[PDB]
Design a protein around this nucleic acid. Structure first.
Length: 488
DNA sequence: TGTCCCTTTATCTCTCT
RNA sequence: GAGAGAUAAAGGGACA
């Protein structure tokens, strides 16, 4: 707190310049999350970390420092990164990721120790081991995978990949041990498949979710009239214990006082933060359907996404100013709000609507179309930045830019165009329309990436097709479409 | 003190249809 | 429209 800021101010000047050049947000973050020690450690080793053999970026260092025990993780990286890159074939990016969590020292040491056994004896890839390690308590998860992977596969009939999926969240050790304990009970008493069991276990707090399913399954079914498929769907997100308990508590209330169906209730609870969306519907539905004039159908549709609560509140706060100061319609506002991160999207529209219409000459329908996707906020911001860049450098039309941005991951598709259009046109003879067309579905980024990988390093199975055929195939079904044909 | 481990909520991207 | 994945943040606990 006070000591942390003390150390920070004393040092701020130096690391604000070479070799780190940390902005103030980076300085506060390290102080707040890594503490005095992390602040001092970063200042001490600021040279060792930015240079050979390590060559870490400022971002990378900040990210390792900004945790409980940052000094230790920073110490451990400097020591073990070469060995893990040299003698285990891991990338520096991977070493950093293992490091960037509470207890990063343990995870790094445990990986060095257990990666050989986990790969050579349990048939795991290094990527898989890295994924298990890349969370709080990774040491525990890796050790528990080492102990329990074979019994979970040999006796319970899970696959390695299911086991890795259960291990690869925080509390992975807890989730795995619970599955071992509860899988037979939950299958052979409540009637669940091991797939359903894995699904519930494969999010953070899985142990809690599993235990709550055992406890509450009979009640939700034999009393509230829900099916086990529905209970599983509620439980199959992070905080699934919170969502289950909340369905039990609020399902009658929500149906009877606000007129919703179980169907709609289950839909609201079946998302990360489901407990929050439920309680926010119960508290926000009146105001919305009355003072604002929304239907319950519309309110349900807004709440039935990850972080539904945030969308709901932002709609209530912005439904006026949007419908009367930018001339949007409530149906549009609903459409924007009805995706994960709806709040972020709504706020970004309000801020960038006049700029995109009045400066770049877009229509408000085009803005709504860009905003009505997951990551709507990202897509809008990247249009603002990359629209002039793409029109001026490559002659893309604003229509084409809109098209690329109006899917999920539109930010990625847009950036991948900026990066890959020159090599695809110049060095491979694609036309911009072709490039745009490939980027004009979802998975624009990976489709474009898949295309350039083939063009610059052909797999034989694909070398039988002309560039045009490849383009047509990329336009047909993106990266999955290229992979399907390689597999022939 | 500092370090390590567990849980819940928000946001973003890919695939299918 | 739906499903799946992923990253992060916040909270909490433990130990000394």
């Amino acid at each position: 707190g006070a000591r942390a800021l003390e150390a920070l101010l004393t040092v701020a000047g130096e690391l604000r310049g070479p070799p780190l050049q940390l902005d103030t947000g980076q300085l506060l973050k390290i102080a707040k999350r890594g503490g005095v020690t992390a602040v001092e450690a970063v200042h001490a080793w600021r040279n060792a970390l930015t240079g050979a053999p390590l060559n870490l970026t400022p971002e990378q260092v900040v990210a390792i420092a900004s945790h409980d025990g940052g000094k230790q993780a920073l110490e451990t990286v400097q020591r073990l990164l070469p060995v893990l890159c040299q003698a285990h074939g891991l990338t520096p990016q991977q070493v950093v990721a293992i490091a960037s969590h509470d207890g990063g020292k343990q995870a790094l040491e445990t990986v060095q120790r257990l990666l050989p056994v986990l790969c050579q004896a349990h048939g795991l890839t290094p990527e898989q081991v890295v994924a298990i390690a890349s969370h709080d308590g990774g040491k525990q998860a890796l050790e528990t995978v080492q102990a329990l992977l074979p019994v979970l596969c040999q006796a319970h009939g899970l696959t390695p990949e299911q086991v890795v999926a259960i291990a690869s969240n925080g509390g992975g050790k807890q989730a795995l041990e619970t599955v071992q304990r509860l899988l037979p009970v939950l299958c052979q008493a409540h009637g669940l498949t091991p797939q359903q069991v894995v699904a519930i276990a494969s999010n953070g707090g899985g142990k809690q979710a599993l235990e709550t399913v055992q406890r509450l399954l009979p009640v939700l079914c034999q009393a509230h009239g829900l099916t086990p498929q529905q209970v599983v769907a509620i439980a199959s997100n992070g905080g699934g214990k919170q969502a289950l308990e909340t369905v039990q508590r609020l399902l009658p209330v929500l149906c009877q006082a606000h007129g919703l169906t179980p169907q709609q209730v289950v839909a609201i609870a079946s998302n990360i933060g489901g407990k929050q969306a439920l309680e926010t519907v119960q508290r926000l539905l009146p105001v919305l359907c009355q003072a604002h004039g929304l239907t319950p159908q519309q309110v349900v549709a807004i709440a039935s996404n990850g972080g539904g609560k945030q969308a709901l509140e932002t709609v209530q706060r912005l439904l006026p100013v949007l419908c009367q100061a930018h001339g949007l319609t409530p149906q549009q506002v609903v459409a924007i709000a009805s995706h994960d991160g709806g709040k972020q999207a709504l706020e970004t529209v309000q801020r960038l609507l006049p700029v995109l219409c009045q400066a770049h000459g877009l229509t408000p329908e085009q803005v709504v179309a860009i905003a009505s996707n997951g990551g709507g906020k990202q897509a809008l911001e990247t249009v603002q930045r990359l629209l002039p860049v793409l029109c001026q450098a490559h002659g893309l039309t604003p229509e084409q830019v809109v098209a690329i941005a109006s899917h999920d991951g539109g930010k990625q598709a847009l950036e991948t165009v900026q990066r890959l259009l020159p090599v695809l046109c110049q060095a491979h003879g694609l036309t911009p329309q072709q490039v745009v067309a490939i980027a004009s579905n979802g998975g624009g980024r990976p489709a474009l990436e898949s295309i350039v990988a083939q063009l610059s390093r052909p797999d034989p199975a694909l070398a039988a097709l002309t560039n045009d055929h490849l383009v047509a195939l990329a336009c047909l079904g993106g990266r999955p479409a290229l992979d399907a044909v390689k597999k022939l």
